[PDB]
Design a binder for this molecule. Structure first.
Ligand SMILES: C[S@@+](CC[C@H](N)C(=O)[O-])C[C@H]1O[C@@H](n2cnc3c(N)ncnc32)[C@H](O)[C@@H]1O
Ligand SMILES: C[S@@+](CC[C@H](N)C(=O)[O-])C[C@H]1O[C@@H](n2cnc3c(N)ncnc32)[C@H](O)[C@@H]1O
Lengths: 168, 172
């Protein structure tokens, strides 16, 4: 099935756990687009509800040159775009470094994947709990050797897309 | 079974394959140190022969902060090797990484098999290592391959993927 990647800037936690909107990091545009294209992701969505942020990201993308990277305002808008491209609603999969008992592995994702997949990646201190609760699935977190697993969102994307590629 | 990572800035290729000395990108410092720490890498070496770069990078590490001995800014691969040899009482296996397939390339699984001592993983900047480093290394890893018409990742993302692959391979 087709795979889409969305980088979301709302609704994130701040250090104090309060809901925030984050600003766009330039390298998240360039780096994740490259990982997306390397592993055959169909489109890369950059989701920010702040018009000023969307205009900053467009300018960066416009000069760095593609219908490939899509700058949009909301997850609802991402879902609508995929339904027009696929004639089917994506499975909504969120990501987190945090433990979730219901979380599935990449292998399990392969077996349960009966339609397009939308992978959600956060910014700042990561998603509020509501995203994790509402998503169709959460992936098991990337862990390494010990307790520390706080990777950049760019590195988390690269790793997950690699694992998805290995598994097929 | 200790793993070390070195980010190198000389000698690198330009777009036309000529030798260049790249400058230290602040995000390579932070982003690769998180990946190394996640996956239990013993030390992260930042290698730049230009004293001005080492100075800038040292300041960035100090401010971004115990674990001040974790990310090591140094001048040459020779210095990296002498440090590991001191820490490990033995010389590491030198493995280079690149997006260009070499006929002699090994897989992670092969790497696991031949790894009887500490491992030093080399990553480049700019447009990658010149052919001399790939010739000089003990081994060169098969590139990360995806869809087939594109594989230009950032070096931060190549480090993440290779460290995950290696971790997983010692769990499977
Ligand atoms: C700077 S991190 C914030 C980390 C936060 N604790 C979280 O929920 O993952 C930004 C994004 O990168 C991804 N990420 C970072 N580390 C991850 C890990 N170890 N496992 C899965 N995703 C990770 C998640 O998508 C996260 O929203
Ligand atoms: C921006 S890349 C330069 C790419 C260059 N064509 C090369 O790989 O030689 C900088 C570093 O990222 C790493 N890298 C990037 N893409 C890679 C890939 N597909 N496979 C392996 N390493 C990669 C290598 O360590 C490379 O030196």
């Amino acid at each position: 099935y087709n795979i889409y990647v969305a980088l979301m800037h709302y609704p994130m936690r701040d250090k104090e756990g309060k809901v925030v909107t984050t600003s766009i990091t330039n390298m998240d545009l360039h780096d994740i687009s490259r990982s997306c294209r390397t592993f055959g992701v169909k489109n890369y969505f950059v989701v920010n509800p702040m018009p000023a942020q969307r205009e900053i990201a467009s300018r960066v993308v416009r000069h760095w040159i593609f219908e490939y990277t899509i700058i949009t305002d909301s997850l609802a808008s991402v879902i609508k775009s995929i339904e027009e491209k696929e004639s089917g609603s994506p499975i909504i999969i969120a990501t987190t470094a945090r433990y979730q008992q219901k979380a599935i592995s990449i292998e399990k994702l392969k077996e349960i994947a009966d339609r397009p997949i939308l992978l959600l990646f956060g910014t700042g201190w990561g998603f509020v709990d509501d995203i994790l609760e509402f998503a169709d699935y959460v992936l098991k977190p990337i862990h390494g050797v010990g307790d520390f697993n706080h990777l950049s969102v760019r590195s988390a994307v690269a790793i997950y897309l690699d694992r998805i590629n290995r598994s097929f």
